Amino acid sequence: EGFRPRTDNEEKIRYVVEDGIFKKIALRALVKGLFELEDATIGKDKIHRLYILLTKKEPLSPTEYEEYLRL
Amino acid sequence: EGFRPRTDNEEKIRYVVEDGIFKKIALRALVKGLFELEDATIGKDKIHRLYILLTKKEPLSPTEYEEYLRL
Amino acid sequence: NIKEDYFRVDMLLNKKGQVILYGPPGTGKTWIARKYVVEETNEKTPGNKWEFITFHQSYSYEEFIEGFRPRTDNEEKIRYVVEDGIFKKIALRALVKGLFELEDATIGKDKIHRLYILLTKKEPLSPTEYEEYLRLKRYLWELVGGLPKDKLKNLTPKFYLIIDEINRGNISKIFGELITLLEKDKRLGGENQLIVRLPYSGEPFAVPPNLYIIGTMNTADRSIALLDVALRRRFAFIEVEPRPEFLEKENLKKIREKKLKTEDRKRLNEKLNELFSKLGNDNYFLKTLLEKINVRITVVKDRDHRIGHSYFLNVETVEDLHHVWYYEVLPLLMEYFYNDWETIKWVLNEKGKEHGNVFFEKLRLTGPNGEEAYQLKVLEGDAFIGALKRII
Amino acid sequence: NIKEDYFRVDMLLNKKGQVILYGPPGTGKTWIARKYVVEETNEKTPGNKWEFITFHQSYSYEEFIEGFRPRTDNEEKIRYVVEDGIFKKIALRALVKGLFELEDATIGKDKIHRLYILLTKKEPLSPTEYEEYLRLKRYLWELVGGLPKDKLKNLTPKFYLIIDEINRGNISKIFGELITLLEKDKRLGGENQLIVRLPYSGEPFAVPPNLYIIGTMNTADRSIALLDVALRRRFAFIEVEPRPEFLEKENLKKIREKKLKTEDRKRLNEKLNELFSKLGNDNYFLKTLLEKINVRITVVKDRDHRIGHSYFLNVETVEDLHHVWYYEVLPLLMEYFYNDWETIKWVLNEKGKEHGNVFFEKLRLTGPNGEEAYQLKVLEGDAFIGALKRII
Amino acid sequence: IKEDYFRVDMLLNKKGQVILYGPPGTGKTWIARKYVVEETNEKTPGNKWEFITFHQSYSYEEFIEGFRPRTDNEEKIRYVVEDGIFKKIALRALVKGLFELEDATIGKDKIHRLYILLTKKEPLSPTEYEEYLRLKRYLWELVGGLPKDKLKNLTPKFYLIIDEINRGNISKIFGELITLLEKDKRLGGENQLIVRLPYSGEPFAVPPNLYIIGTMNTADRSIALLDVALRRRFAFIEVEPRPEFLEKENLKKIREKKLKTEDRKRLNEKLNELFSKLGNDNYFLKTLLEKINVRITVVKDRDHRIGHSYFLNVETVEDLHHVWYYEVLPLLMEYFYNDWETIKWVLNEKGKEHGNVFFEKLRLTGPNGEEAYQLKVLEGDAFIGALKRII
Amino acid sequence: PPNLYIIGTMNTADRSIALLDVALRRRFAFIEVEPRPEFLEKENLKKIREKKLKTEDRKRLNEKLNELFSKL
Amino acid sequence: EGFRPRTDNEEKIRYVVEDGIFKKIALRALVKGLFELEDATIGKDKIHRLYILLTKKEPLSPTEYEEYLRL
Amino acid sequence: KGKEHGNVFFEKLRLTGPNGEEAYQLKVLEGDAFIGALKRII
Amino acid sequence: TTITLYEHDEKRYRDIAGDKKAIQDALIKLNKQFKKDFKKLDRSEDNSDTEDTIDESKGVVEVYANKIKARHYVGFAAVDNVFLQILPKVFKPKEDTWEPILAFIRMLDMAYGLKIKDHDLAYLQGRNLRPNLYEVFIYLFAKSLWSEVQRGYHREYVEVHREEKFLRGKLLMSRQIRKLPHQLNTFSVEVHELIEDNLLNRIFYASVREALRRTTWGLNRKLLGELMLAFDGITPIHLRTEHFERVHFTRLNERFRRPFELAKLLFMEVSGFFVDMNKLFERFIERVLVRNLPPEYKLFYQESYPFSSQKPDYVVRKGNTPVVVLDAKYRELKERIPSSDMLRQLYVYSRIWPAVIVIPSSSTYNQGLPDKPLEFEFFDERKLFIVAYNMDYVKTGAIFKADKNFRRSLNNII
Ligand SMILES: Nc1nc2c(ncn2[C@@H]2O[C@H](COP(=O)(O)OP(=O)(O)OP(O)(O)=S)[C@@H](O)[C@H]2O)c(=O)[nH]1
Numbered sequence A, B, G: 001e002g003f004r005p006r007t008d009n010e011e012k013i014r015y016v017v018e019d020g021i022f023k024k025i026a027l028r029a030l031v032k033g034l035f036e037l038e039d040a041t042i043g044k045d046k047i048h049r050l051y052i053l054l055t056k057k058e059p060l061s062p063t064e065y066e067e068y069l070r071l
Numbered sequence C, D: 001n002i003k004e005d006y007f008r009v010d011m012l013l014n015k016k017g018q019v020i021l022y023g024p025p026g027t028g029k030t031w032i033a034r035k036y037v038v039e040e041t042n043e044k045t046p047g048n049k050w051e052f053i054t055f056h057q058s059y060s061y062e063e064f065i066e067g068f069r070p071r072t073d074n075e076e077k078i079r080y081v082v083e084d085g086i087f088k089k090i091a092l093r094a095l096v097k098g099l100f101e102l103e104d105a106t107i108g109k110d111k112i113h114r115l116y117i118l119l120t121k122k123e124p125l126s127p128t129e130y131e132e133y134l135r136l137k138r139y140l141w142e143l144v145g146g147l148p149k150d151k152l153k154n155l156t157p158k159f160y161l162i163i164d165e166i167n168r169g170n171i172s173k174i175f176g177e178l179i180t181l182l183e184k185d186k187r188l189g190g191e192n193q194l195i196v197r198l199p200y201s202g203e204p205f206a207v208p209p210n211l212y213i214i215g216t217m218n219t220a221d222r223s224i225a226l227l228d229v230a231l232r233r234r235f236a237f238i239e240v241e242p243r244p245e246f247l248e249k250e251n252l253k254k255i256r257e258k259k260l261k262t263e264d265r266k267r268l269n270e271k272l273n274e275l276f277s278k279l280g281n282d283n284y285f286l287k288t289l290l291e292k293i294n295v296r297i298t299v300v301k302d303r304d305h306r307i308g309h310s311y312f313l314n315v316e317t318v319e320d321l322h323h324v325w326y327y328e329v330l331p332l333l334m335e336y337f338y339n340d341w342e343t344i345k346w347v348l349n350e351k352g353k354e355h356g357n358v359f360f361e362k363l364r365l366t367g368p369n370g371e372e373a374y375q376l377k378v379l380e381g382d383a384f385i386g387a388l389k390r391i392i
Numbered sequence E: 001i002k003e004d005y006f007r008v009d010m011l012l013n014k015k016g017q018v019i020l021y022g023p024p025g026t027g028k029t030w031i032a033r034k035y036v037v038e039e040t041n042e043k044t045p046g047n048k049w050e051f052i053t054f055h056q057s058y059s060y061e062e063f064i065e066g067f068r069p070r071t072d073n074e075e076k077i078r079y080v081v082e083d084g085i086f087k088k089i090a091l092r093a094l095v096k097g098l099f100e101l102e103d104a105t106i107g108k109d110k111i112h113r114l115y116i117l118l119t120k121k122e123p124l125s126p127t128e129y130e131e132y133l134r135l136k137r138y139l140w141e142l143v144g145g146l147p148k149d150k151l152k153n154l155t156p157k158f159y160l161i162i163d164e165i166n167r168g169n170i171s172k173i174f175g176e177l178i179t180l181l182e183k184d185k186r187l188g189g190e191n192q193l194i195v196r197l198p199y200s201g202e203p204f205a206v207p208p209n210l211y212i213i214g215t216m217n218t219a220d221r222s223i224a225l226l227d228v229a230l231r232r233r234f235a236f237i238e239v240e241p242r243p244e245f246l247e248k249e250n251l252k253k254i255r256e257k258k259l260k261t262e263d264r265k266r267l268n269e270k271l272n273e274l275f276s277k278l279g280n281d282n283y284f285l286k287t288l289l290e291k292i293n294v295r296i297t298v299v300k301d302r303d304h305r306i307g308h309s310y311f312l313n314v315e316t317v318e319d320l321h322h323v324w325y326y327e328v329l330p331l332l333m334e335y336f337y338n339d340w341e342t343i344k345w346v347l348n349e350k351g352k353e354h355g356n357v358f359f360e361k362l363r364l365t366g367p368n369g370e371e372a373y374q375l376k377v378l379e380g381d382a383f384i385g386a387l388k389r390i391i
Numbered sequence F: 001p002p003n004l005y006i007i008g009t010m011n012t013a014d015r016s017i018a019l020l021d022v023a024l025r026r027r028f029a030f031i032e033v034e035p036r037p038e039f040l041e042k043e044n045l046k047k048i049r050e051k052k053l054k055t056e057d058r059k060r061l062n063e064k065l066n067e068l069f070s071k072l
Numbered sequence H: 001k002g003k004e005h006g007n008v009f010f011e012k013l014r015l016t017g018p019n020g021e022e023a024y025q026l027k028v029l030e031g032d033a034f035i036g037a038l039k040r041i042i
Numbered sequence I: 001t002t003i004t005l006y007e008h009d010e011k012r013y014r015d016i017a018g019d020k021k022a023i024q025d026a027l028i029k030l031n032k033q034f035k036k037d038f039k040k041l042d043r044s045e046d047n048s049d050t051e052d053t054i055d056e057s058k059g060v061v062e063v064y065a066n067k068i069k070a071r072h073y074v075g076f077a078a079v080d081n082v083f084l085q086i087l088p089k090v091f092k093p094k095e096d097t098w099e100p101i102l103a104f105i106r107m108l109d110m111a112y113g114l115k116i117k118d119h120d121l122a123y124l125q126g127r128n129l130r131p132n133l134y135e136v137f138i139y140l141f142a143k144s145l146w147s148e149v150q151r152g153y154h155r156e157y158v159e160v161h162r163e164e165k166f167l168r169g170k171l172l173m174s175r176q177i178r179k180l181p182h183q184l185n186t187f188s189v190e191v192h193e194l195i196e197d198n199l200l201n202r203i204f205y206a207s208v209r210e211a212l213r214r215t216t217w218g219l220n221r222k223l224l225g226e227l228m229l230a231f232d233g234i235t236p237i238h239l240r241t242e243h244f245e246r247v248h249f250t251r252l253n254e255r256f257r258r259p260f261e262l263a264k265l266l267f268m269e270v271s272g273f274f275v276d277m278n279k280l281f282e283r284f285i286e287r288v289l290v291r292n293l294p295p296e297y298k299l300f301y302q303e304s305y306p307f308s309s310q311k312p313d314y315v316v317r318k319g320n321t322p323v324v325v326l327d328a329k330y331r332e333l334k335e336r337i338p339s340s341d342m343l344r345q346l347y348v349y350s351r352i353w354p355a356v357i358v359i360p361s362s363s364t365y366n367q368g369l370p371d372k373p374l375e376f377e378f379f380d381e382r383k384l385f386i387v388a389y390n391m392d393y394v395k396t397g398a399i400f401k402a403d404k405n406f407r408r409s410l411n412n413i414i
């Protein structure tokens, strides 16, 4: 986990926390493992939303990043 | 690549991602490689437009930097 | 016999204030410290009443007490607000949680409870409430200096701090303000109450009498050349010996059945009866094997380089004993003796043996200047058991 | 208390200006620095009259007197301002508090009171009043340039800075400007008034004669010892030897009932009578035990690695003496002589003994190349006192 | 008396920058402070002289020039390059020297405007800082159009008296100054050098007024000025620890210099009572410091010698006891940490084990045949009999 | 989570296994991948190169390896 | 060559790139070199305009630095 | 190397160390005696 | 195999351990290695003949067809698992070879200038270890290091201009002002941090690693094993001669002088060192004379040039007037008379300095022993006075009884 700069529609530099390699593969191993659990079916829609977001590349806008930090 | 300020509007100084030399030479080798390819003929009239932007021997103009970004 | 080890820690932790469970690795020093705090304050997770924290070689004072750290402010440009570390987020927390139960006519219990919420906040501090955190922290150290020493010894919630691998980090540099404070007398409420002024934030800071900093020092790495004055007088050192008494037939059965379930303990009984029958029907075999190999370690090398007993505590067959002897004992044994061979075979008393059922066989081609190089040799089946039955 | 270690600090600190209480760990160095300042200033907590800070290796020159420290303003988050450290906030505090009773500041006595408010202000300085603070600071060093040396010799408060473990930090770097100010005739009012020019703020600075610095270095470690010969002249070293005379029967009753003046004096006295009656009714046992170890450590180790009298000061019973032996000083003795068994057997005066009532039993298994090592033995009961009576 | 005063005054005109090096405890900062005060008649630092002292955090950016945030408006923090301590002196020593010239530097309205913005204690507002940066560009356009005869003789002598010059990383602090600190490489010299600074880019040259008298200690050999190119620039005055001041008469002449005959009668009978207990000899502390400094020269080095700042402030025999056991014997023990047969020889008690010895012998011995001594706090007239045996 | 396994890879020509950090020789478990010369036979070098190439490249690979070991 | 902040009187901190000592000698030697000959160096007033903007004692204004970057 | 007293920049201290060490001191000369200690270099 | 020699002593190849071919292979490397490193060590009347004798495989050892003979070069060397040690012939006896080891190191203590402790050597006396010079100088290095590492670790300060995620030390301002706001998230400081792996600690990690690999005791393997664990975080280096020169001894690492000089004496193939037995006695007598000659000051190596300069080993003069020449010779002095080569040099040293001359010689059970007083007065038909003095050697013990007998004979000579 670290700090990385990011532009907000061609504006001044906005710092945002972007997860590295190990945390993006440990959280991915968690949200993929919670599919086949019978007790984790209380949030199966929202966990599946996290796994699609965690395997895609370059989250372009903060509207899905705040969705990502909420999930 | 890194972040550089540009000559935008006066009260609207922007931080764009100006590419370095290794990204510019690897894109230029990829653009020139696909320019003479037969199966990449979907947008070959636009790959030659991307080649002129990469051999442009000057800092890129801000009214057409988004044309460089979209290509 | 583990309640005496939960009483040996407990009698020293109220007399000296903090301990260090120093001992060779693979013994249970991390497990004794974690299962004493969970048994004392019933919280299975870190956070509120204790905080697990390990040390490393690049761990610094600014991550422990406080330091200047760049922090984002509500999804915008960074500021440079000074962040309290992992100690100061629990040393202040042990103070304001203890100050709930104190019935004095000067406590701002509405203000202290507001400071307690901002200290247990798992999210980072936003600048709309970080100034509310620093202002309430300023009220705390104006209040602590006004309370007498009679009402700052009986604070009820015992806070803990498992410092894992305390000798791996540079101990005198991490404990900057904590090698003048970590005594039982230099805490708050004691006879020698010291409120030490900090360099970075500039606010005074003092350890409360609730906080007990349990340490789990491995001593096969970064050995007994410690600080020897500051980080040695404050800590009441407890030696956690590698006990081979937990490696009999009944002791392996009793350990692996209490944590087990209904159907697991019958299968663990059938597995262990199959294992010790392949060893020669010796119920005291793994005890005698570990006790014999520990005597050869303490004679040649130091007494704190012995092979522990967390390795052999999770075996169920001969094949699992093979995968713990060739990957958690013999690579550990070649680490201590610095790739030596003529003394690593005396530990197994295979000094006058080569090319047979030996763990280190000599290559049949000597070097130019008469030197010889040995090689680790994998075994299997009854050849490996016959190679273990002559260590005893 | 007032006999030797108080009256030789107060006489020497008033003559030299700075005192370092160098001595081995376990001696009253931090305690005699804390007791002298509290009994002088009549303020049992830090803050106004005195400041207790401690040095470490992460301690900065920029955080001691002056440095660029980035603050967090509202609209400009990254704002680099020059912030005075703790010494410049106690040297300016000792100056403008002492300048309340002078007769040449008759134009700006309100400005000196306003500057004293800004230095006692524990709130962080807003940038609307930081320029008011800097305008009053450069007014102050204009005012002491027009003050005569006959009127700056007697400033009626007495401010203190107890730095603890002074030798741990880079003392040549922390005392940047202070390696030429810290002298009795080189402060303000002395025979050579020196107002040096600080690097960062560009404002002149001079230590007032109001201030005193009581360092307490530790001299068990040697890589952090104070060998700066140009700095050892500025201080005045006081060797606090570890006195075993605080461990007699009458002395333990006089040291432990002076602090605890509650109604448990009948409880401590009957417990200390029972403790020494188990020791053979020897009123000079623990005095002889610490003396016959510190002499036997002085002859083989250095003279500054001796056992202090803070280990055996808090003993109450034989069970408490057993806890302070096997867990505090015997792991300490195994740290001094780490696998040097012929020395550590001799320090406890068990050199010929290898079996029976002894702390270190001899293993009955020698090594390959003729080496042999020993093993601890947890003793208890009257056999433990029979292993302590052999030392004295 | 005036010999060390005149010796500084001679070398500060020949080489340009003197260094008073010596063992710690002698008059190095004192003879440097008394020289600049008696030559400039200014007892506190200010325009005519400035005292600084070096350390490891005294880098190049705050000594000559570097970037420094400064706005003086509580808004619009202007990241501008600000001159350090030295360039605020060398520009001040130049524009003070450009007053007495007749018609060579025709800047009599623009030089005095630059001097009043250089001695201004209040920090520079940006509406007047643009005037200060524009007049400084006029200065190095002025200097360069002046003849060397009207630039060598600038009248008012400025001093940057620095201290512990060895303690800072001197080759890093001296940046562009590493080639300008000769007497003939200044302004007005035979080979003037208008050298260029990195950060601001404005050129720079030291005026011939500015003299750098820098005191250092040479007992720390870890940090000594061993650069052989910063020993050519400086003139190194030997300041040895002189025990001539520790007589009865020479101690009475020094310690009764500023007392106005009020406590001088108290001091006269106090020194009469000190030397009556030492054996009625006026020459005790002279040969006590001599027989220690000679015995510490043949053992450690020439540079670790005990100074004469320790014994200079003694009044009675009790104050000599508190400066022996607390300032110099802890100093003598940390030269020779656990080196006991050497520190016994500095006090020449080498055959003396017990009795009136500072280091009594422990009655124990070692298992391998070793021994170690123990410090013995002596009091009364037995202390003097343990001290007179050194002589 | 207990899914994430950390398969390291260590070129130990420069740094030996004893010259690692102390929280690496005990958290991890070391497998020595020994240099096997048995992959360089006449039939073993053919089988390894048969997985990457095609059928017509394999006869040229067979003829070149027959030309190689005949010269040796 | 390096980066350098430059706020003139009231503008924002526009991060200009300031040429060091060497480029203000290397460009100054090249422009004074080309000023004496006339083979294909058209725009001798344009080369002279670059030489004036290299010996500026004052720092360059943003209305003059931008034409200095073009020349 | 052989001159230890008289017109020499370094006189010898009269006593040696406890284990065979011996140090000197920088003697300040003046006048023609300084030249006589300087012309013996050449 | 362990082979041991005394000065001018021989061993048979048939009785010797190991192989006949293995020892002669070890020696021809050692005598060749002594050729390239001959000029570093000084001599005194050695008759070395540098051109012919040393390069003919006769530098240290004379390897012959039927035996192995030692020259007069004292010390030790370990080559190809054939550890050679050459003790002086004076300490030869009539634990049986453990007295001459501590005698030779004590003669290597006072003469050569080492500052080892007597309680370092007295720890080994009686522990029935195998006598070996390499096993004790590794121990004298390892004990003096582990007694100087147990107190302090030698963490020395370097300054680094490092970009840190936190703020430690002085913040660099010219590197932080010119920082773009896209990279503002790291401070740029210049912190004076203390590093454990300094150059003196890289050497002592490498000097231990090359010592534990080549040690054979059970005491040094335990002591170097604890030293290597204390130096675990230090990155290793390959030792050279540039590394032992690049460090300088200031006041903050002066206590590491004793292990480093012994680490330079043993490390820099070959291992160990050799010195001439003539000069080592010439240096050892110089410690005895200046201590024992209060009336007259004595200087070693004073030279007077005839006609090619023939210089005495030592001359004592009170002021300048008495000329009492003292030339130290390692010769046995058979038949109670000096030889042709000895007395011819004694005649020149007296004439070019009315000058008496005294020759000190060794005396033990093995060497030739004269009577207790000044044994031989001689006149060379020019009113000369040649006195044959003999120093007895209680240096095998720890007490200096013979120094009083040497002073009493010198007081009758003075
Ligand atoms: N009453 C009394 N208590 C003493 C005396 N000497 C030591 N103590 C006790 O010793 C305890 C700790 O001693 P302390 O002075 O703090 O050691 P220290 O100087 O800090 O040791 P270090 O680690 O810095 S080196 C205190 O609780 C104090 O009560 C004494 O002379 N009188």
Ligand SMILES: Nc1nc2c(ncn2[C@@H]2O[C@H](COP(=O)(O)OP(=O)(O)OP(O)(O)=S)[C@@H](O)[C@H]2O)c(=O)[nH]1
Pocket: D179, D180, D185, D186, D191, D192, D230, D231, D233, E023, E024, E025, E026, E027, E028, E029, E030, E031, E215, E216, E217, E245, E254, E308, E309, E312
């Ligand atoms: N009158 C007089 N006083 C002296 C003389 N030498 C030293 N002193 C006094 O001794 C005190 C200490 O001398 P000082 O100059 O401060 O030592 P120092 O060389 O600066 O010490 P250092 O750490 O920087 S190395 C001064 O206050 C000074 O008054 C002298 O020759 N005459």
Ligand SMILES: Nc1nc2c(ncn2[C@@H]2O[C@H](COP(=O)(O)OP(=O)(O)O)[C@@H](O)[C@H]2O)c(=O)[nH]1
Pocket: C002, C024, C025, C026, C027, C028, C029, C030, C031, C032, C216, C255, C309, C310, C313
């Ligand atoms: N049940 C039980 N398990 C133990 C005991 N001691 C150690 N263990 C086991 O040891 C393991 C922990 O080892 P650890 O403390 O991390 O070793 P170390 O920190 O390297 O010294 C756990 O899996 C426990 O199951 C014990 O007394 N009882």
Ligand SMILES: [Mg+2]
Pocket: C029, C030, C164, C165, C216
């Ligand atoms: Mg652990």
Ligand SMILES: [Mg+2]
Pocket: C179, C180, D029, D030, D164, D165, D216
């Ligand atoms: Mg302390």
Ligand SMILES: [Mg+2]
Pocket: D179, D180, E028, E029, E163, E164, E215
């Ligand atoms: Mg000074």
